[PDB]
C-alpha cells in the first residue's frame, strides 16, 4: 500500500461495543510487544517480546 502505517494501533477487550466495564489500550507498531492499557484511573505500560 501507498499509505504508511501509523506507529500506534488500538486494542480492545471485547467484540461488542456495549459491554459495561471493558479495558481498551494501544499497541506500538514500531517496537512490537509494547502495550499501554487504561481502565478508569488505573493505567499501565509494559513491553514483552524481542528487542
Amino acid at each position: 500500500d501507498k499509505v504508511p502505517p501509523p506507529a500506534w494501533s488500538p486494542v480492545f477487550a471485547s467484540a461488542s461495543v456495549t459491554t459495561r466495564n471493558q479495558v481498551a489500550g494501544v499497541r506500538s507498531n514500531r517496537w512490537p510487544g509494547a502495550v499501554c492499557a487504561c481502565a478508569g484511573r488505573h493505567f499501565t505500560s509494559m513491553y514483552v517480546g524481542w528487542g
Binding site: 502505517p5 501509523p6 494501533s9 488500538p10 480492545f12 477487550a13 471485547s14 467484540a15 512490537p32
Partner: protein
C-alpha cells in the same frame, strides 16, 4: 499418547512467550470450536494461531483435517483453514492458485482488519487480503509445523495416524526429537536437517517442559511436556519472514 492438542493446555504453557488470547475470546473459543467442528465434517479442529493487524481485530486462525494420507513420499493432510475476528463466528479460507500464490509473497506489510481489502501491484494487479492471509498461513505451516518424532505411524491403506503407544522423546532438548508434520514416519528427517541456527530450544529439565521457538519465523512457539506427554504449538504476531537471519545470529 495424546490424540489432539488442547486449547487450554496450549494457552497455559505458551502464556509466558506472549502467546495469549483475550479472556472473552477464550470463552467464545471454548463454546464455538465444537460448533465449527460439527458444522464442517472435520474430526480434529484446533486453534492454529493469531495474526496481528493494523486494527485491534486480530485474525484468529483455526485448522482442521479429515484425512491424512501418505502421498509421493510425504505425509499430506487435507487441511482446511478458518478465520475469525472474535471467537464466536468463523469463516473459511479458500486456497489460492499459483499465480496469486507468487503475487502474494511480494506484499510485505501488516494486514488490515477488513478482509475485503485489495492490495495493488504491478498494469495493476488487484489482490484480495484473504489471499495474502492464506499465503502467509501456508508459508508458516510449510516452514514450522512441528510435532515430536514417532508421534505418528503408518497403518494399512497408508494413513498417518497417532502412535497410541508413543512413550515420549528421550533427550527433549535436542532438535533430533522433533520433526515436521509432513515428514513420513519412517524417514529420519527432523528439525536438525533444517538450517542450523533457525530453531532455539530451551528445556526446563526439572519441570520437564521443552520450548522450541522459530527464529526464521519469530512468532512461532511449540511446547512439549514430557511427564504428561502433551505437545502443542501456536503462532502469535504477523506472518512476515526474517530474511536476514545471518546478521542477527
Amino acid at each position: 499418547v495424546q490424540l489432539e492438542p488442547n486449547i487450554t493446555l496450549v494457552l497455559k504453557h505458551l502464556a509466558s512467550c506472549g502467546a495469549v488470547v483475550s479472556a472473552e475470546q477464550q470463552a467464545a473459543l471454548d463454546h464455538s470450536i465444537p460448533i465449527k467442528r460439527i458444522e464442517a465434517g472435520l474430526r480434529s479442529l484446533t486453534l492454529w494461531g493469531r495474526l496481528t493487524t493494523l486494527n485491534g481485530k486480530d485474525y484468529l486462525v483455526a485448522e482442521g483435517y479429515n484425512v491424512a494420507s501418505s502421498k509421493e513420499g510425504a505425509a499430506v493432510y487435507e487441511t482446511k483453514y478458518f478465520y475469525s475476528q472474535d471467537g464466536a463466528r468463523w469463516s473459511d479460507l479458500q486456497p489460492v492458485d499459483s499465480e496469486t500464490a507468487t503475487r502474494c509473497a511480494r506484499i510485505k506489510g501488516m494486514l488490515s482488519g477488513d478482509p475485503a481489502k485489495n492490495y495493488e501491484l504491478e498494469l495493476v494487479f488487484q489482490i484480495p487480503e484473504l489471499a495474502v492471509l492464506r499465503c502467509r498461513v501456508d508459508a508458516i505451516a510449510t516452514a514450522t509445523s512441528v510435532i515430536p518424532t514417532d508421534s505418528t505411524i503408518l497403518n494399512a491403506a497408508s494413513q498417518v495416524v497417532p502412535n497410541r503407544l508413543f512413550a515420549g522423546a528421550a533427550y527433549p532438548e535436542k532438535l533430533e526429537s522433533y520433526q515436521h508434520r509432513f515428514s513420513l514416519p519412517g524417514s529420519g528427517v527432523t528439525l536438525s536437517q533444517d538450517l542450523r541456527g533457525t530453531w532455539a530450544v530451551q528445556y526446563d529439565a526439572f519441570k520437564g517442559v521443552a520450548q522450541v521457538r522459530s527464529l526464521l519465523f519469530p512468532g512461532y512457539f511449540f511446547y512439549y511436556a514430557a511427564n504428561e506427554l502433551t505437545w502443542g504449538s501456536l503462532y502469535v504476531g504477523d506472518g512476515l519472514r526474517n530474511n536476514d537471519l545471518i546478521f542477527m545470529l
